[PDB]
Amino acid sequence: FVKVVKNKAYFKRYQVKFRRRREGKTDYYARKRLVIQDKNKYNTPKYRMIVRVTNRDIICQIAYARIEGDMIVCAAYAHELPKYGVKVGLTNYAAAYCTGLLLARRLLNRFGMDKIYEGQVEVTGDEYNVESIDGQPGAFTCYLDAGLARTTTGNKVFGALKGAVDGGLSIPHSTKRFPGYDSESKEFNAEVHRKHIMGQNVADYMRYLMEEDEDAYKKQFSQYIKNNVTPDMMEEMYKKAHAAIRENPVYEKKPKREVKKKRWNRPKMSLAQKKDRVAQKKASFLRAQERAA
Amino acid sequence: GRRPARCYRYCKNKPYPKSRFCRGVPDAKIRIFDLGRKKAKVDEFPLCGHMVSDEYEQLSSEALEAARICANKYMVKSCGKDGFHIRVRLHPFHVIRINKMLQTGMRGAFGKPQGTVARVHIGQVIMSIRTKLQNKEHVVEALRRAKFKFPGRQKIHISKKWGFTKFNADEFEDMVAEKRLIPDGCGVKYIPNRGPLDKWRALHS
Amino acid sequence: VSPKVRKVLQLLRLRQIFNGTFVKLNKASINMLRIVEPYIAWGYPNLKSV
Amino acid sequence: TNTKGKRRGTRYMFSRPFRKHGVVPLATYMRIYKKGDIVDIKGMGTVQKGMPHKCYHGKTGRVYNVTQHAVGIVVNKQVKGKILAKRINVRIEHIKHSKSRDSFLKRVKENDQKKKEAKEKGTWVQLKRQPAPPREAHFVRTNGKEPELLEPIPYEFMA
Amino acid sequence: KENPMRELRIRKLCLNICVGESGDRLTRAAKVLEQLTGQTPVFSKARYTVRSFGIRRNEKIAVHCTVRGAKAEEILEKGLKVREYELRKNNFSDTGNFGFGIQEHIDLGIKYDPSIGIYGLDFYVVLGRPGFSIADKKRRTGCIGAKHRISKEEAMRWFQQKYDGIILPG
RNA sequence: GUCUACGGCCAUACCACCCUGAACGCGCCCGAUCUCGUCUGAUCUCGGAAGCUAAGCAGGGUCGGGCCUGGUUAGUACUUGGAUGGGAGACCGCCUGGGAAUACCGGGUGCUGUAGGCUU
RNA sequence: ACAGAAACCUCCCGUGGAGCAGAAGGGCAAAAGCUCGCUUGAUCUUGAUUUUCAGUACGAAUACAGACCGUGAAAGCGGG
RNA sequence: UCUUGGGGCCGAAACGAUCUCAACCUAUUCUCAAACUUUAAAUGGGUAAGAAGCCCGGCUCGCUGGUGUGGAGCCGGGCG
Ligand SMILES: [Mg+2]
Ligand SMILES: [Mg+2]
Ligand SMILES: [Mg+2]
Ligand SMILES: [Mg+2]
Ligand SMILES: [Mg+2]
Ligand SMILES: [Mg+2]
Ligand SMILES: [Mg+2]
Ligand SMILES: [Mg+2]
Ligand SMILES: [Mg+2]
Ligand SMILES: [Mg+2]
Ligand SMILES: [Mg+2]
């Protein structure tokens, strides 16, 4: 027999990590450097672009930190994209670009800078940085908050970053992590990046499956077929998505409806209930003991 | 060999245990703190008499060893080698030093370890004897003799607890009836109304 | 006289033996009188004493 | 004699409290310190940069300078028979806004409002604080019961 | 009816050959694993120096590799055939895994080669159910849960059903 | 009622086991052409949507351990100031104020900010 | 499998009970530890401050400011 | 208590049986720390208790900046 390590003393001495760290959601080493503002800038907010890719969505937010909790300034979601013509593939690189662009256009519309800072209305996929215009309100500057993502080349967080810079936001970055950057030659190809932004990597995959295996094709792209999304029309679908996104980036909140009260889980038992339950258990145990005797 | 115990009777210095900073301490004179029928169950010996210190002082491990023998011999002679259980309740942890002369004088005068002593307080128990109730007079006489091996004033006091347990003698038996006390050999375990109800089942099954 | 008692006796204006003053009582002053307790006789005077 | 070492004697002073080690909560860096603020200095061992010297632990000062990470504090230090005003540079991890002036500031506002509210009403209100007065006369009702007689208990040798 | 997401599967097959000494033998051993599996193995270095074993720290003394998916089952069949699908109850770890050893690698259907020699190796089969990867991911890593774990009995039962094997007492 | 993204305080939130989870989610999950990275598409990256709450996750449970908070311990131990108080001393008592901590007993078991959902 | 108390492989628990050049003390868990990759902020420069203190020097150290760089996707971090 | 050893002890002999004493683990229990500690006093050490304050309106900036933002400075004014 060996010592119980997780004994009573192991818990008397135990210190728990920050809740968000226990949950595995926040990197507090990274958060401190991202969100903390220089003390000589006082209350000047330090904005950052949050990009989180779930199993079925892309969440893009513009937040600055306060003592009580972050204040989300603007937010766009990939599940909004159907309003703009994109029905499927809401977690690919092209959707990330659309989600990011919608975030930038939505934010600039709010501050009234959309006309001033239109960004790169024509997607070339190349290094582009917006510059403030003298005599006009400065360009909105934020930073990318990649979370726990492994920020390698082609990571979709940089697709959303590319959408936001092309939307008019000022976000420091390089092209090293856009798809099309070649490590061997240390050279960046803007056409390869433009392919991913338009999803030609997805479309080229479709033709591959179609010309290689019909059954594997149906398995991999069943919902593309259902929505009548074909490899030829993909680029114009996304192009029609950008133009509509720039045309109207405003969000209209889903109208909140009253709901009849309904409790879907138990409440805590009261002290009387818990105390009685032990009383019932004790009587039942003795009652069963007396019978067997 | 060793100095008269009057040289170290008073708790003048801070506690000086045998540790990694005090190396070379010789072994203590007292190595056995229990004797008699240590294995008696809690219920065989309801009586407990203490020798209580009236003085704040240091007792030497030689006096603890001497008293242990003195008290034990009289108990064996009057109650049998299995009619009692003695427990010396003081352990000699404080170390006393000696600055051995024959010359440097008082230069570099920090002393080497010389022995060990137990630091006892007013009201602290020095040793205890539990035996049967018809040995109340024998316990008092056993402890009265042991006092002559110690410096200062002690008092013999018959406890109201049950043997070496912390529970009052008059209410010990009922607590055992209600299974609030479960004998565990020399002493008892205390059963609170807490924790998994399964334990309560095992006790009450 | 100790430094703290010596200051408090000077604030009460009792710089000499058998010197007398009236003191209106409250938490602030009652705690001062506690400091100089071994150095003063005090109590509640009546109209005749005033 | 003793060494003149900078961090001598701070075994417990600069250590972290029990079960409060690890990450530094980020609201420690979200505090806004302005020129003229009152701050309590408390060295934190987790951050070894900008650590105030041990003589400044538990002293309160006035902020006179603010930089990217630290502030300049004017804090009184007594050295023999004089008190010096010392200007130290301390990273904002080791300080915290003092609450001492708040009870004053809270009073300043309530006074000015009372002084303005009573003025328009042509009355008079108390603004100055006062030490606790001796408790006024009052009746104590026995409620038809006799006070419990108390006696000293016999000595009993509980050894 | 058992939930489909509770069924057992072979997470990975761990093949190891502790040659015991760097040099020509160890390099040959790496080749044998490459033949059996089809992927380059990776050496492992001695953690310490043990005079009796004749190993010095940071010295390559073993070669191992991980085989998963369809290839893992095919090679597992080879080894269990060599054992006649007979294992001992002790061969099953309390965590739901099991393993066995092979004396000569030629018995696994590998043609002998004069330039390589013969070698033994270890087979350790790590079992799992769907969802076992929540503990190996980066974001929101968690523990699978008591009801989702695999027991010595369950693995022994799986071995019998999957291969009709025999679990020898002792 | 409750979830998701980002949080503040950082166990009342942890740990162990058990029960239950509507909808949207979050996941598990299916693949490796592309981006990317591995001995291994297990992880990381990427493309998906057949299946499932089994697990994570959420809520509830346990005369649960821990944690938090009270009571008792106790006006006790300790302590500021006082005496030409006691005692051979060791120490102790009183006067004037302050005043703890175990064992033991009870109760509680996350709150909450911004943005976005689901829930007649 | 050879393989043993001890070689290498696997799973599980693991609040640090390891490690961080050295004395000890403090500090540290997606790090301050281990491993890779790129590197020379261990560079150039004026002041202020802290520590011992006489509020002198040295030494060491702390916030800044001006350049030139490294690194990172970036926020930042780095003048041992 | 077999997860290891000492004595035996039926034996054909094995982790078969039989015990037994050790170590091991589990709750207990006596006694301790100047160079231990979850707790934690008294006495004590800073600070604040207004006119150098409080509240208004405006101007300057090369500093910071989505923002006529932020911060600092300056100017006039009202409050005892
Ligand atoms: Mg990072
Ligand atoms: Mg003599
Ligand atoms: Mg001395
Ligand atoms: Mg469980
Ligand atoms: Mg459902
Ligand atoms: Mg896979
Ligand atoms: Mg379930
Ligand atoms: Mg409990
Ligand atoms: Mg909750
Ligand atoms: Mg790191
Ligand atoms: Mg610089």
Swiss-Prot record, chain A:
One CC-aspect GO term: cytosolic large ribosomal subunit
Region spans: Disordered: 251-293
Modified residues (Phosphoserine): S183, S270
Subcellular location field: Cytoplasm; Nucleus, Nucleolus
GO MF annotation, one: structural constituent of ribosome
Domain of life: Eukaryota
UniProt cross-link Glycyl lysine isopeptide (Lys-Gly) (interchain with G-Cter in SUMO1), position: K218
Modified residues (N6-acetyllysine): K3, K46, K218
Record-listed cross-link Glycyl lysine isopeptide (Lys-Gly) (interchain with G-Cter in SUMO2), residues: K218
Listed Basic residues bias regions: 256-266
Keywords: Acetylation, Cytoplasm, Isopeptide bond, Nucleus, Phosphoprotein, Ribonucleoprotein, Ribosomal protein, RNA-binding, rRNA-binding, Ubl conjugation
Function recorded in the entry: Component of the ribosome, a large ribonucleoprotein complex responsible for the synthesis of proteins in the cell. The small ribosomal subunit (SSU) binds messenger RNAs (mRNAs) and translates the encoded message by selecting cognate aminoacyl-transfer RNA (tRNA) molecules. The large subunit (LSU) contains the ribosomal catalytic site termed the peptidyl transferase center (PTC), which catalyzes the formation of peptide bonds, thereby polymerizing the amino acids delivered by tRNAs into a polypeptide chain.
Family: Belongs to the universal ribosomal protein uL18 family.
Name of the protein in question: Large ribosomal subunit protein uL18
Organism encoding this protein: Oryctolagus cuniculus
Swiss-Prot record, chain B:
Gene3D superfamilies found in the cross-reference section: 3.30.60.300, Ribosomal protein L10e/L16 (3.90.1170.10)
Protein name in the entry: Large ribosomal subunit protein uL16
CDD domains in the cross-refs: Ribosomal_L16_L10e
Cellular component annotations (GO), alphabetically ordered: cytosolic large ribosomal subunit
The record's account of how the chain is modified after translation: Citrullinated by PADI4. Ufmylated by UFL1.
Keywords associated with the record: Citrullination, Cytoplasm, Developmental protein, Isopeptide bond, Ribonucleoprotein, Ribosomal protein, Ubl conjugation
Family: Belongs to the universal ribosomal protein uL16 family.
Gene name in the database record: RPL10
Highest taxon listed in the record's lineage: Eukaryota
Compartments, as annotated in UniProt: Cytoplasm
Molecular functions per Gene Ontology: structural constituent of ribosome
UniProtKB/Swiss-Prot annotation, chain D:
Gene Ontology annotations for the cellular component aspect, listed alphabetically: cytosol; endoplasmic reticulum; ribonucleoprotein complex; ribosome
GO molecular function terms noted in the UniProt entry: structural constituent of ribosome
A Pfam family matched in the record: Ribosomal_L21e
Main localization (coarse): cytoplasm
Keywords associated with the record: Cytoplasm, Endoplasmic reticulum, Ribonucleoprotein, Ribosomal protein
Renumbered residue ranges of the record's region Disordered: 111-144
GO biological process, one term: translation
Biased composition (Basic and acidic residues): 111-122, 135-144
UniProt keyword annotation of Zinc-finger present: no
Location(s) in or outside the cell: Cytoplasm, Cytosol; Cytoplasm; Endoplasmic reticulum
Coiled coil feature spans: none
SUPFAM superfamilies hit by this protein: Translation proteins SH3-like domain
Similarity-based family: Belongs to the eukaryotic ribosomal protein eL21 family.
Function according to Swiss-Prot or TrEMBL: Component of the large ribosomal subunit. The ribosome is a large ribonucleoprotein complex responsible for the synthesis of proteins in the cell.
Subunit text: Component of the large ribosomal subunit.
PANTHER family, per database record: 60S RIBOSOMAL PROTEIN L21 (PTHR20981)
Stated name of the protein: Large ribosomal subunit protein eL21
Curated annotation (Swiss-Prot), chain E:
One BP annotation, GO: translation
Pfam families hit by this protein: Ribosomal_L5, Ribosomal_L5_C
Principal location: nucleus
Organism: Oryctolagus cuniculus
InterPro entries: Ribosomal_uL5 (IPR002132), Ribosomal_uL5_C (IPR031309), Ribosomal_uL5_CS (IPR020929), Ribosomal_uL5_dom_sf (IPR022803), Ribosomal_uL5_N (IPR031310)
UniProt function note: Component of the ribosome, a large ribonucleoprotein complex responsible for the synthesis of proteins in the cell. The small ribosomal subunit (SSU) binds messenger RNAs (mRNAs) and translates the encoded message by selecting cognate aminoacyl-transfer RNA (tRNA) molecules. The large subunit (LSU) contains the ribosomal catalytic site termed the peptidyl transferase center (PTC), which catalyzes the formation of peptide bonds, thereby polymerizing the amino acids delivered by tRNAs into a polypeptide chain.
Key word Signal present: no
Subcellular location: Nucleus, Nucleolus; Cytoplasm
Residues recorded with modification N6-acetyllysine: K45, K78
Recorded GO MF terms: rRNA binding; structural constituent of ribosome
Keywords, ordered alphabetically: Acetylation, Cytoplasm, Isopeptide bond, Nucleus, Phosphoprotein, Ribonucleoprotein, Ribosomal protein, RNA-binding, rRNA-binding, Ubl conjugation
GO cellular component: cytoplasm; nucleolus; ribonucleoprotein complex; ribosome
Name of the protein in its database record: Large ribosomal subunit protein uL5
Post-translational modification Phosphothreonine, affected residues: T37, T40
Top-rank taxon, per record: Eukaryota
Glycyl lysine isopeptide (Lys-Gly) (interchain with G-Cter in SUMO2) cross-link, renumbered residues: K31, K45, K147
Classification of source organism: Eukaryota, Metazoa, Chordata, Craniata, Vertebrata
Annotated family: Belongs to the universal ribosomal protein uL5 family.
